[PDB]
Write a protein that binds this DNA or RNA. Structure first.
Ligand SMILES: [Mg+2]
Ligand SMILES: [Mg+2]
Ligand SMILES: [Mg+2]
Ligand SMILES: [Mg+2]
Ligand SMILES: [Mg+2]
Ligand SMILES: [Mg+2]
Ligand SMILES: [Mg+2]
Ligand SMILES: [Mg+2]
Ligand SMILES: [Mg+2]
Ligand SMILES: [Mg+2]
Ligand SMILES: [Mg+2]
Ligand SMILES: [Mg+2]
Ligand SMILES: [Mg+2]
Ligand SMILES: [Mg+2]
Ligand SMILES: [Mg+2]
Ligand SMILES: [Mg+2]
Ligand SMILES: [Mg+2]
Ligand SMILES: [Mg+2]
Ligand SMILES: [Mg+2]
Ligand SMILES: [Mg+2]
Ligand SMILES: [Mg+2]
Ligand SMILES: [Mg+2]
Ligand SMILES: [Mg+2]
Ligand SMILES: [Mg+2]
Ligand SMILES: [Mg+2]
Ligand SMILES: [Mg+2]
Ligand SMILES: [Mg+2]
Lengths: 225, 402, 131
RNA sequence: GUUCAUAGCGACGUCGCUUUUUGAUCCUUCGAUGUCGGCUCUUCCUAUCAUUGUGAAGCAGAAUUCACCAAGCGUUGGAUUGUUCACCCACUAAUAGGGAACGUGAGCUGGGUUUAGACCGUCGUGAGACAGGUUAGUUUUACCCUACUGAUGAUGUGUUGUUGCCAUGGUAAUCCUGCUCAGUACGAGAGGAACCGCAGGUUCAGACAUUUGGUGUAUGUGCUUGGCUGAGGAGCCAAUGGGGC
RNA sequence: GAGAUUCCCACUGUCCCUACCUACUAUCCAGCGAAACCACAGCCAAGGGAACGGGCUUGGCGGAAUCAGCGGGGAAAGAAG
């Protein structure tokens, strides 16, 4: 169910967490009020790891994962790689890709079965996705927007998308992922959906400024409570 | 009329006699306040500025951006061979201040220590303390010495020990040792006299005075810069290019009245070679020095718990303008006043260290030992020879070496 | 939390930097830096991650003769990053944001400094890469 | 001032202070005290803009206003103008007001005024005039005394050295942001704090060169132009030949 | 057009914000060797006074001989404004 949250008075909770059905990465600079909401509302089984990447807290935008695997970007230290490894369940395998577009959460989004990807991914990293996230990579992005990862959040039950998506791109998208995509917003008018929200299959965290009306659509599209 | 725009003053008036220091050593001027509840301990030490390098360590500062992260921090190496105690001074409190009550010197004063008493050691007859040391043997002199100790016990309030460094263990040209009064704190006057009297003629290593990851004060004389103008001495604004008689000057050195030049106006003169006291310098490491049990041990100087490389604190090709460091050393964090091989005074902190910057455990991961005589790129000799392989001079040597 | 450490600024008032977003602006002319108290004769200068007041000198005509808040995302001046890394970029670049910190545009061309990305999450989302 | 003289204001009157305005006077200076502004730099005042501690309100909170102790610290970057003033842009805790021969020209500058050249308008028959406009117009000397900045020394302790004490003088730190407290107290709501704690920054100060950058005639090592030593090799000259590191 | 003015590109140490290097000085020495100026001289606060004192009154105080600088004063010098 949509819990609102904030990391250090910032509503962009998509920047500071990564939820997958199996693990939950959460950023390091925070302080209980945020970590709790995760640990609390999370389904006990799914561990919650305090992580960073390259030292930074925006780990949700620097990291792409599903239940099978996490890809961390080239700037990831090995003190970090190790600590993500020594905290996740050893189903999930971690590969530190080496892609020019380090922002792996901005530039690719994946559920447990598909990934939209940004036109300019290296073929190398297309393979390291579909070999680690056991997924079907599909270089497709909406009209214009190439940062799929950030403008379109999707689970295995539904998905949101930038409010300014066409009914036709919606259409096609909802093919590839074979999930019902609704155009929407979060944090009271924000297009950058992914920046604002983190979704599982059983939980959703949105920012403290998400209007009730939005909170609803989230619940609905994600087929939650 | 008032100056049109406000601007803060250039330089501090708290260091006004901007003159060459009357001393080269750097005197303490304030010892830590003595409390008898503490155990008896020494409060200061003498070291020599060997050089600088940088280290890699992990930070344990919660709530910080660099929490659990690696940082690179510059450090200063201060070579600290053990001090030798040769005397005891007693002071008595008077309504005119502390005054020296009685001084007792040990027998067998070291030869390098005795050099301090002579302006021309080469022509001297080396007669200093020769008649004094005779009173440590006869009963008449020994009775007088015991009265001097008893008088110190019943009349003196603070006692100090005279300690000197050991020039023969340093790569310097100077053979004249540095004498220093180091205050003994932490006990009754009787206890600190008994403690000091046992240490006569003995060696006090630096690890008995200071400890790991504690913050001390460094006292010394800065690098001399000679006669300097106002732009370099007081960092005043340079005048425009169109100025006739010179632009590295202060344009107005005072109003018409008070009809004099004030002491607060920036003026040219000596820069550098000033006595300074910097507080809150953390001890990152106290090096262990060279040993010989079966072979020479150097690993205990630069190897960490994560490096495990048999290397000493000395850079590749040696410390520039200093020499080789073979004794105990203190790795202080940051910069320290003075040139290379400048004698420095290390003093216990006068403050109570309670902030989280203090009382923080320091655990080194890496110590840089690249050559500082250029853009060095190799930590050790063996790493360099492994990288480059055999060279032409190695071939012609091995040709002669069969 | 954690605040930004001090870095070398290298972009005084009057610097023209590139505009890295798709707002149609081509460059940003820095007229002042947010949070600068000042000093007599000292130019207010900005590094990466600093909010500045900027006007666009060339670009779309509806953005030109106005004052825009902007955030520096890349700089040509080297700066130390607390682990001995001295990093500099090929060009000085910034994006146009509002006072709340979110961008007027929607995409960023080129990398974004890690110092800027951590401090502005709305900028970090649109960043193609973080350097 | 919804009532209510005095929270905050104060008509009609009336008592003062100040010398950062302009007058009035003509005491000093006409065998000359260099005449505006800006720049630079120091110090002082308080009639306090901010910051510390407080009292009051028509002080719910937030914000604001009045007053007290208070000058420790700070009071900025620019467009136009010679400007002082002025006005606007922007940042800021605040962008307070003043003095020091309207501080400061053997400190600078010389944009202005205020010589001699010249143009215009008005005035004059004219020469010429104009707190009218415009353009071009030499900014001299310190080596003296003191002051100040540094540097040797000097008196006395027999000589000389080491280690010290402290009279006295100076003095230095400053302000802000974010997190948490906390969407909390308070409030119908809108909004919306604070103490402790943590992480950082600004201005200032004192250093320092491990790292990054600058310098570079180590005239170190390559490259290179013209010339010269018969050529090669090795070099040199071109007021540091030029250039890379 | 070595005429007066405004803007733009380029360019740069004009500036932020200063640093380093080179030559010649200055500096020290051997030799040589002026001039300007000069009532006497030369530490301040306040007072009064030709109303801004080096001298006078009252106080603060005052320690040989000097070197390199410096530009606050000598209402410094230069010229019967
Ligand atoms: Mg003022
Ligand atoms: Mg000139
Ligand atoms: Mg070096
Ligand atoms: Mg200025
Ligand atoms: Mg009434
Ligand atoms: Mg008269
Ligand atoms: Mg005159
Ligand atoms: Mg005069
Ligand atoms: Mg008052
Ligand atoms: Mg004047
Ligand atoms: Mg003058
Ligand atoms: Mg003049
Ligand atoms: Mg003129
Ligand atoms: Mg004329
Ligand atoms: Mg006529
Ligand atoms: Mg002319
Ligand atoms: Mg001379
Ligand atoms: Mg005192
Ligand atoms: Mg002061
Ligand atoms: Mg040639
Ligand atoms: Mg040849
Ligand atoms: Mg020739
Ligand atoms: Mg010639
Ligand atoms: Mg170079
Ligand atoms: Mg007087
Ligand atoms: Mg006359
Ligand atoms: Mg005449």
């Amino acid at each position: 169910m949509a819990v609102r949250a904030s990391f250090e008075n910032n509503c962009e909770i998509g920047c500071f967490a990564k939820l997958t059905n199996t693990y939950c990465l959460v950023a390091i600079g925070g302080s209980e009020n945020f970590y709790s909401v995760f640990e609390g509302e999370l389904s006990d089984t799914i561990p919650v790891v305090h992580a960073s990447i390259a030292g930074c807290r925006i780990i949700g935008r620097m990291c792409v994962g599903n239940r099978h695997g996490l890809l961390v970007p080239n700037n990831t230290t090995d003190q970090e790689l190790q600590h993500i490894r020594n905290s996740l369940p050893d189903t999930v395998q971690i590969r530190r890709v080496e892609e020019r577009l380090s922002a792996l959460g901005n530039v690719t989004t994946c559920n447990d079965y598909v990934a939209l990807v940004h036109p300019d991914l290296d073929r190398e990293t297309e393979e390291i996705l579909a070999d680690v996230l056991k997924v079907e990579v599909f270089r497709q992005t909406v009209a214009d927007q190439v940062l799929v990862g950030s403008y379109c959040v999707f689970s295995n039950q539904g998905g949101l998308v930038h409010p300014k998506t066409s009914i036709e791109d919606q259409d096609e998208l909802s093919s590839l992922l074979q999930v019902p995509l609704v155009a929407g917003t979060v944090n009271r008018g924000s297009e950058v959906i992914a920046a604002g929200m983190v979704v599982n299959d059983w939980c959703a965290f949105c920012g403290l400024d998400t209007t009730s009306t939005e909170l609803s659509v989230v619940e609905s599209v994600f087929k939650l409570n | 009329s008032h100056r049109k725009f406000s601007a803060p003053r250039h330089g501090s008036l708290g260091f006004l006699p901007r003159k060459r220091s009357s001393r080269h050593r750097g005197k303490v001027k304030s010892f830590p306040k003595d409390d008898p509840s503490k155990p008896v301990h020494l409060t200061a030490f003498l070291g020599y500025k060997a050089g600088m390098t940088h280290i890699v360590r992990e930070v344990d500062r919660p709530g910080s951006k660099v929490n659990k992260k690696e940082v690179v921090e510059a450090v200063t190496i201060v070579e600290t061979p053990p001090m030798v105690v040769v005397g005891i001074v007693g002071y008595v409190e008077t309504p005119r201040g502390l005054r020296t009550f009685k001084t007792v010197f040990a027998e067998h004063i070291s030869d390098e220590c005795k050099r301090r008493f002579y302006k021309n050691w080469h022509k001297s007859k080396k007669k200093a303390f020769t008649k004094y040391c005779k009173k440590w043997q006869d009963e008449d002199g020994k009775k007088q010495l015991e009265k001097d100790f008893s008088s110190m016990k019943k009349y003196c309030q603070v006692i100090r020990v005279i300690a000197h460094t050991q020039m023969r263990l340093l790569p310097l040209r100077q053979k004249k040792a540095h004498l220093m009064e180091i205050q003994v704190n932490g006990g009754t006057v009787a206890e600190k006299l008994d403690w000091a009297r046992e240490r006569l003629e003995q060696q006090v290593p630096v690890n008995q005075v200071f400890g790991q990851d504690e913050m001390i004060d460094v006292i010394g004389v800065t690098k001399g810069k000679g006669y300097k103008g106002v732009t370099s001495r007081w960092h005043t604004k340079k005048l425009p290019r169109k100025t006739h008689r010179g632009l590295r000057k202060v344009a107005c050195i005072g109003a018409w009245h008070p009809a004099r030049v004030a002491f607060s106006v920036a003026r040219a003169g000596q820069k550098g070679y000033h006595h300074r006291t910097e507080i809150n310098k953390k001890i990152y490491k106290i090096g262990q020095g060279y040993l010989i049990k079966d072979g020479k041990l150097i690993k205990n100087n630069a190897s960490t718990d994560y490096d495990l490389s048999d290397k000493s604190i000395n850079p590749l090709g040696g410390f520039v303008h200093y020499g080789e460091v073979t004794n105990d050393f203190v790795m202080l964090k940051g910069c320290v006043v003075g040139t290379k091989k400048r004698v420095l005074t290390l003093r216990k902190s006068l403050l109570v260290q309670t902030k989280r910057r203090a009382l923080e455990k320091i655990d080194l991961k890496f110590i840089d030992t690249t050559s500082k005589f250029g853009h060095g790129r190799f930590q050790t000799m063996e790493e360099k020879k492994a990288f480059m392989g055999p060279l032409k001079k190695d071939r012609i040597a091995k040709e002669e070496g069969a | 939390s954690g605040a930004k450490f001090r870095i070398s600024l290298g972009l005084p008032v009057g610097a023209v930097i590139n505009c890295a977003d798709n707002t149609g602006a081509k460059n940003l002319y820095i007229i002042s830096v947010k949070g600068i108290k000042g000093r007599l004769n000292r130019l207010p200068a900005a590094g990466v991650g600093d909010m500045v007041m900027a006007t666009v000198k060339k670009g779309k005509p509806e953005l030109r003769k106005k004052v825009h808040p902007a955030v520096v995302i890349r700089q040509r001046k080297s700066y130390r990053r607390k682990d001995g890394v001295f990093l500099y970029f090929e060009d000085n670049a910034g994006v146009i944001v509002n006072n709340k910190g979110e961008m007027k545009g929607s995409a960023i061309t080129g990398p974004v400094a890690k110092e800027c990305a951590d401090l502005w999450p709305r900028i970090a989302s649109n960043a193609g890469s973080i350097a």
